[PDB]
Amino acid sequence: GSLLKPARFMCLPCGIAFSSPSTLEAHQAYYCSHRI
Amino acid sequence: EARECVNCGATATPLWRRDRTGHYLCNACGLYHKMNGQN
Ligand SMILES: [Zn+2]
Ligand SMILES: [Zn+2]
């Protein structure tokens, strides 16, 4: 059910798109606030 | 162009530095991860 796996590699609020989901993790831990 | 920065997105960095986790950072954001010590 649901989605589980993220098929999106581009932040909506930020507007910065990535080519590697591995780095997107660090992006969402800094750019889209220092969230954990 | 080269890679996608996770902190600024500036691809016009003189060099890229990879963090211990395996991420690609620039000379600015990458330096922060080193100097700050923490994440
Ligand atoms: Zn983001
Ligand atoms: Zn950077």
From Swiss-Prot, chain A:
Protein's cellular compartments: Nucleus
Tissue specificity annotation: First expressed in stage 5 at high levels in the primordium of the amnioserosa. Also expressed in germ band extending embryos in cells of the developing anterior and posterior midgut and in hemocyte precursors present in the cephalic mesoderm. In embryonic stage 8, it is expressed in blood cell precursors. By stage 10, it is expressed in hemocyte precursors that have spread throughout the lateral and ventral head mesoderm. By stage 11, it is expressed in the dorsal ectoderm and in precursor cells of the hemocytes and fat body.
Zinc finger (CCHC FOG-type): 3-36
Top-level taxon of origin: Eukaryota
Transmembrane segments: none
Residues binding Zn(2+) 1: 11, 14, 27, 32
Role: Transcription regulator that modulates expression mediated by transcription factors of the GATA family such as pnr and srp. Represses transcription of proneural achaete-scute complex (AS-C), which is usually activated by pnr. Involved in cardiogenesis, blood, and eye development. During hematopoiesis, it is required to restrict the number of crystal cells, probably via its interaction with the isoform SrpNC of srp. Negatively regulates expression of sr.
Record remark on domains: The CCHC FOG-type zinc fingers 1, 4 and 5 directly bind to GATA-type zinc fingers. The Tyr residue adjacent to the last Cys of the CCHC FOG-type zinc finger is essential for the interaction with GATA-type zinc fingers.
Quaternary state and interactors: Interacts with pnr, although weak this interaction is essential. Interacts with the isoform SrpNC of srp. Interacts with CtBP corepressor.
Family according to the record: Belongs to the FOG (Friend of GATA) family.
Protein name: Zinc finger protein ush
Species per Swiss-Prot/TrEMBL record: Drosophila melanogaster (Fruit fly)
Top-level taxonomy: Eukaryota, Metazoa, Ecdysozoa, Arthropoda, Hexapoda
Gene that this sequence comes from: ush
Residues represented out of the complete protein: 202 to 235 of 1191
From Swiss-Prot, chain B:
Subunit structure: May form homodimers or heterodimers with other isoforms. Interacts (via the N-terminal zinc finger) with ZFPM1. Interacts with GFI1B. Interacts with PIAS4; the interaction enhances sumoylation and represses the transactivational activity in a sumoylation-independent manner. Interacts with LMCD1. Interacts with CREBBP; the interaction stimulates acetylation and transcriptional activity in vivo. Interacts with BRD3. Interacts with MED1, CCAR1 and CALCOCO1. Interacts with EP300. Interacts with CEBPE.
Effect of residue 6 to G: Disrupts interaction with ZFPM1. Binds normally to DNA
UniProt-reported outcome of changing residue 25 to P: Disrupts interaction with ZFPM1 and binding to DNA
Tissue localization of expression: Erythrocytes. Expressed (at protein level) in liver.
Role: Transcriptional activator or repressor which probably serves as a general switch factor for erythroid development. It binds to DNA sites with the consensus sequence 5'-[AT]GATA[AG]-3' within regulatory regions of globin genes and of other genes expressed in erythroid cells. Activates the transcription of genes involved in erythroid differentiation of K562 erythroleukemia cells, including HBB, HBG1/2, ALAS2 and HMBS.
PTM annotation: Highly phosphorylated on serine residues.
Record localization: Nucleus
Domain notes: The two fingers are functionally distinct and cooperate to achieve specific, stable DNA binding. The first finger is necessary only for full specificity and stability of binding, whereas the second one is required for binding.
Zn-finger region bounds: GATA-type: 5-29
Consequence of changing residue 23 to R: Disrupts interaction with ZFPM1. Binds normally to DNA
Protein name: Erythroid transcription factor
Residues spanning the membrane: none
Entry-annotated residues carrying N6-acetyllysine: 34
Impact upon substituting residue 26 to R/S/Y: Disrupts interaction with ZFPM1
Species per Swiss-Prot/TrEMBL record: Mus musculus
Consequence of changing residue 31 to F: Stability of binding to DNA reduced
Taxonomic lineage of the native organism: Eukaryota, Metazoa, Chordata, Craniata, Vertebrata
Annotated spans, Required for interaction with ZFPM1: 4-23
